[PDB]
Amino acid sequence: TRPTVRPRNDVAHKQLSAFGEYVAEILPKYVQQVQVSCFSELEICIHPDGVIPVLTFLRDHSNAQFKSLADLTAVDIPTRQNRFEIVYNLLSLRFNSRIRVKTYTDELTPVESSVSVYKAANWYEREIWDMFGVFFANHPDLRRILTDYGFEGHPFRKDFPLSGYVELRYDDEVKRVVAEPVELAQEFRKFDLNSPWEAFPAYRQPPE
Amino acid sequence: ILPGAAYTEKSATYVNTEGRAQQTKVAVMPPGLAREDWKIIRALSEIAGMTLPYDTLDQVRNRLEEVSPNLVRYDDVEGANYFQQASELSKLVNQQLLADPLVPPQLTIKDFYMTDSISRASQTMAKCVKAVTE
Amino acid sequence: TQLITVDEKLDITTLTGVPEEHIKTRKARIFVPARNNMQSGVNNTKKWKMEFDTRERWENPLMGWASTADPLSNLVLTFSTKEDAIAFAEKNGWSYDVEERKVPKPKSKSYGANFSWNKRTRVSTK
Amino acid sequence: LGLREIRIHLCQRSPGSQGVRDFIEKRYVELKKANPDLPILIRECSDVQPKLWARYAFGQEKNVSLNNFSADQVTRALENVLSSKA
Amino acid sequence: TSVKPIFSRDMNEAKRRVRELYRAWYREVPNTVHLFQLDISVKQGRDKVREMFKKNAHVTDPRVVDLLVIKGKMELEETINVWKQRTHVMRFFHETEAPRPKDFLSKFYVGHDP
Amino acid sequence: GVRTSPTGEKVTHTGQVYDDEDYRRVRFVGRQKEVNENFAIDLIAEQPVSQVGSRVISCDGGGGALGHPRVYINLDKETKTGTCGYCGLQFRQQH
Amino acid sequence: LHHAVIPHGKGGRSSVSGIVATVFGATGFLGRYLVNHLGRMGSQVIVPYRCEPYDTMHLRPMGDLGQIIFMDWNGRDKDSIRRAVEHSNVVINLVGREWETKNFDFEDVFVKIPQAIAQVSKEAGVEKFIHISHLNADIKSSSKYLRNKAVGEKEVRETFPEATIIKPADIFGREDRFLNYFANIRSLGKKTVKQPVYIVDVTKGIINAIKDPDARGKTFAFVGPNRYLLFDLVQYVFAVAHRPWTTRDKVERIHTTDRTLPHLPGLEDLGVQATPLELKAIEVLRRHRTVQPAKTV
Numbered sequence A: 001t002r003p004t005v006r007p008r009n010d011v012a013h014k015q016l017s018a019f020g021e022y023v024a025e026i027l028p029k030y031v032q033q034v035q036v037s038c039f040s041e042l043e044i045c046i047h048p049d050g051v052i053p054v055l056t057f058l059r060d061h062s063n064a065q066f067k068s069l070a071d072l073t074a075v076d077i078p079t080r081q082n083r084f085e086i087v088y089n090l091l092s093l094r095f096n097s098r099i100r101v102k103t104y105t106d107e108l109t110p111v112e113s114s115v116s117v118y119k120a121a122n123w124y125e126r127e128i129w130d131m132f133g134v135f136f137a138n139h140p141d142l143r144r145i146l147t148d149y150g151f152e153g154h155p156f157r158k159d160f161p162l163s164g165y166v167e168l169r170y171d172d173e174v175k176r177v178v179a180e181p182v183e184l185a186q187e188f189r190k191f192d193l194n195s196p197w198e199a200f201p202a203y204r205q206p207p208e
Numbered sequence B: 001i002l003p004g005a006a007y008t009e010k011s012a013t014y015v016n017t018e019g020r021a022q023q024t025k026v027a028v029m030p031p032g033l034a035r036e037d038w039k040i041i042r043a044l045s046e047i048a049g050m051t052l053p054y055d056t057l058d059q060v061r062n063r064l065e066e067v068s069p070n071l072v073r074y075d076d077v078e079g080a081n082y083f084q085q086a087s088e089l090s091k092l093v094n095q096q097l098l099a100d101p102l103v104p105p106q107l108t109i110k111d112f113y114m115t116d117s118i119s120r121a122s123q124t125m126a127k128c129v130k131a132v133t134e
Numbered sequence C: 001t002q003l004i005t006v007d008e009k010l011d012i013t014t015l016t017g018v019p020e021e022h023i024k025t026r027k028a029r030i031f032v033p034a035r036n037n038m039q040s041g042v043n044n045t046k047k048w049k050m051e052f053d054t055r056e057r058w059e060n061p062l063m064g065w066a067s068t069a070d071p072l073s074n075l076v077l078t079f080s081t082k083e084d085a086i087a088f089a090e091k092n093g094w095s096y097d098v099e100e101r102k103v104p105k106p107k108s109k110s111y112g113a114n115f116s117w118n119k120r121t122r123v124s125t126k
Numbered sequence D: 001l002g003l004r005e006i007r008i009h010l011c012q013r014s015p016g017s018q019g020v021r022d023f024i025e026k027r028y029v030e031l032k033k034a035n036p037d038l039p040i041l042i043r044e045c046s047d048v049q050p051k052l053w054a055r056y057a058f059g060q061e062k063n064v065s066l067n068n069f070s071a072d073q074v075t076r077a078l079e080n081v082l083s084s085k086a
Numbered sequence E: 001t002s003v004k005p006i007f008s009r010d011m012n013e014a015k016r017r018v019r020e021l022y023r024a025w026y027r028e029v030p031n032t033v034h035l036f037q038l039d040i041s042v043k044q045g046r047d048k049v050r051e052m053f054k055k056n057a058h059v060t061d062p063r064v065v066d067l068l069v070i071k072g073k074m075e076l077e078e079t080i081n082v083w084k085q086r087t088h089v090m091r092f093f094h095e096t097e098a099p100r101p102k103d104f105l106s107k108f109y110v111g112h113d114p
Numbered sequence F: 001g002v003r004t005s006p007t008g009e010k011v012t013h014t015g016q017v018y019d020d021e022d023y024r025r026v027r028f029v030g031r032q033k034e035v036n037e038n039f040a041i042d043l044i045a046e047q048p049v050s051q052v053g054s055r056v057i058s059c060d061g062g063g064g065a066l067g068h069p070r071v072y073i074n075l076d077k078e079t080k081t082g083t084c085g086y087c088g089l090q091f092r093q094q095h
Numbered sequence G: 001l002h003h004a005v006i007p008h009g010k011g012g013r014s015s016v017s018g019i020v021a022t023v024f025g026a027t028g029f030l031g032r033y034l035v036n037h038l039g040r041m042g043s044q045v046i047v048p049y050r051c052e053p054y055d056t057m058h059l060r061p062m063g064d065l066g067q068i069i070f071m072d073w074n075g076r077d078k079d080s081i082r083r084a085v086e087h088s089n090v091v092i093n094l095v096g097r098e099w100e101t102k103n104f105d106f107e108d109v110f111v112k113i114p115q116a117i118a119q120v121s122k123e124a125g126v127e128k129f130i131h132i133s134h135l136n137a138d139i140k141s142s143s144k145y146l147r148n149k150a151v152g153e154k155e156v157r158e159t160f161p162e163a164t165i166i167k168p169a170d171i172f173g174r175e176d177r178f179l180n181y182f183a184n185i186r187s188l189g190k191k192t193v194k195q196p197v198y199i200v201d202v203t204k205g206i207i208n209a210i211k212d213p214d215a216r217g218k219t220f221a222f223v224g225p226n227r228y229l230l231f232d233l234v235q236y237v238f239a240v241a242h243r244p245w246t247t248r249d250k251v252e253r254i255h256t257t258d259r260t261l262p263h264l265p266g267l268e269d270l271g272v273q274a275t276p277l278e279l280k281a282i283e284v285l286r287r288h289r290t291v292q293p294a295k296t297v
């Protein structure tokens, strides 16, 4: 499996599994899962009441020093009752490593803002307000960042349509750019592309 | 002429020969000015001044449950009892059996392809009939 | 305490930005999609799907393209169980109808049945 | 101006429909012999409550819930429906 | 059924926040009609504010009306600070849109929508 | 082989022409309806049928990897020629 | 009814209204808002233009792709008129000049060109024809404008018997020459009574006259809701505009009172409510700034 297959990094896998055990046993109040991917990325799935105590740990602890917040992300998964999956990506420049801190909320439960840990989060979770509708409590300036000013709805939710509900055009009667319900001259064509044969037997879920 | 919708053009309850009620779904919309059929009847009732107590398809199906409650329980065969009572009722009139033989109207494959107004308008059914009649 | 008690029904229709016409006139359909009979694979029958009723698609006068005015005409949602899809429809105020999962009932397969002594289940050729 | 059709809805297995079942097992035939030109539509369903719909002239439909009745109570309500014609 | 709140513990604090947001909008409307030089009256804009508050009047969940108050404060902040233009303020008034058919018969006449 | 409707409009290789009472001819008023006058159905009819002495022929449309996927055509029917599904060149067994 | 002209959609920009409209004079003031309200339904609007194509640019965002067909025409070329109307199911006329020019007088613009458009539209099979006269059109009128417009109205009525002829009183709006005339005159006050009509009311009346089949052969009088004297109207214009090119034909028409024609229907019989002057005069005259309403009768 040399030329076309990605080489497995067992050293980093062992080190990240050990540090995942380390974080899981220092903070058992909030750590719910710890997993390491086959391409060696550590995920620490925590409880949403421990957003600040976990992230302040990894930023400040001398065996962690995750001083950089690379990215902050939500993922809409509507089949869960807590549909939004808040993803922190952290970079330790000291130990040359990356960690992922995952948590969850629904539309109505607020998540605590992590600007007290990473000021970088000030826009990112604000984008999570704009795109997903997740509210962040004790945020300095929480408002929209990317959508238009009168925009109704949160676009990256998966029940939100691809084109929106409204569209703009200039109207010379009122001398104004106006919004109207969206009509497309050509509809977006939906492609059912998924093959009915199982692609990956390792990821098979057990039946009912 | 009141142009209506076809079975691919409306959500619509059809009941098969075993009693199972089943709903179609709107695949395409009716062409031109043609509308859904009960929409036409309901609009005719409102023009005539004898307006009917339904506006949406769900209210039509509430009416349809009022008339018989098994026309809204879809993909369900509701069992029908009381064979003995219909047997007792059928003995009242002594209707005579005619001497004509039992002949079904569809004897060969020639008679199968064109039965209703969709199949008679179908050029594929026309080629099937032309293929089996030679 | 730090936890409140809300015994109301979960409803978020005022927060999703969806207009009224695309909440209270749409019929979501919650269903396991059937296997394509062009194929024998069954990986597309594994999850539940939520779609909506089809609205009018008309002809573009310039090109003949399929013009639509339904924003929800391409929205297909994936759910692991029936109850998750029902909860997501009820949460968004979508009136829905549910079709039960139609698994194929198990068959009785015997290769020797093709060559029986007295039964009609012989194959006339192989 | 007059009664046009009668609709009797009931269940196959519910106990509340039992007397209604006892009305049709015993007392429908001499009902139907008494009213040959009257549609009396018996509709059994899975989990419905017993019910008696009477459509009168010009679309008027009266309704009598027959839940937890005996056969005699169904007989009295149905003969009130027949003698009513309202 | 034990959930974590946003700001309000029950519906009374929630209605208090709704009421103060309504006060802020009601005070802001003449300033908005002046500095965006809108062609509506002050009474017409205040009727639109009353309409936008009565549209959400059916809600009994404290978290949902807390988010409605938060989004109303965001819209007010986009209004007071001139972040909206005249167009974003006048999108509440669907003025280029033709009036939709309401009864059964006109909806029958125009098309297939229920 | 372009032809012409009674409206004077050219009919394409599809067979598309607007009706006389169709308003959408007004888009060609003062302008032109761009049609292509090289009909491929007539141009592949101009090609001669290739007499080959084999039973199964292979066609790739010429040019090697500049034609189409290479297919194999059976020539056991003598009433019908063996037409390639991609390029339309039709073949015949000479015996 | 042909399959391409059946209406489809929800009445938006990409919809189909089934209105194939030839608007003569779309490059002016009424044609601006008329092509706006037609194209926002999804109507095939044919714009025959006489002017530079640059002066038609504002008509281009008013509809979907291919839903506005611009083409050349001449008022003295019936072939160009036939080339413009031979596919339309409605023809609207809006050709007008407040002033007569070297190559066109009022007899050319109001009599010859509308009769040519209506005759060619009759002999091309156009279903609906709409003519736009003036409310004060009279044979015995003092101004040449209204005399030739009464003559042209009579000719349009006798060569297209189903022509919906419309009588606006004095159309005000943004690009008007009525309130912008009064705000830039810095003539006088007499016993002249006017009820000016708003341009969006006129446009809704024209399109509801297209949509009403009963408006064929009718004659409508599009008037405003409030009748004003000339003097307090002009004082209201100078009160809103924050103030302390002409010919004598315009002087005769400003001092010509807007007549009352109760035997003719108006905006209300097409389903249009008339918008009063005070709700739109600030919108019109805000441009002229560097208020107690007028007295009605």
Ligand SMILES: NC(=O)C1=CN([C@@H]2O[C@H](COP(=O)(O)OP(=O)(O)OC[C@H]3O[C@@H](n4cnc5c(N)ncnc54)[C@H](OP(=O)(O)O)[C@@H]3O)[C@@H](O)[C@H]2O)C=CC1
Binding pocket: G024, G025, G026, G027, G028, G029, G030, G031, G049, G050, G051, G074, G075, G094, G095, G096, G097, G098, G104, G109, G132, G133, G134, G135, G168, G169, G170, G171, G172, G176, G177, G178
């Ligand atoms: N206040 C008002 O506007 C009122 C108007 N009316 C009537 O309504 C009609 C339209 O009014 P309105 O828009 O205001 O007037 P405009 O002068 O603004 O518009 C007239 C239109 O006709 C065109 N046109 C003018 N003269 C000729 C000609 N000789 N040959 C070809 N095209 C020509 C112009 O095009 P181009 O730019 O190329 O010159 C323009 O598109 C007129 O008949 C007018 O009398 C009636 C009552 C009130």
Ligand SMILES: [Zn+2]
Binding pocket: F059, F060, F061, F068, F084, F085, F086, F087, F088, F089
């Ligand atoms: Zn080939």
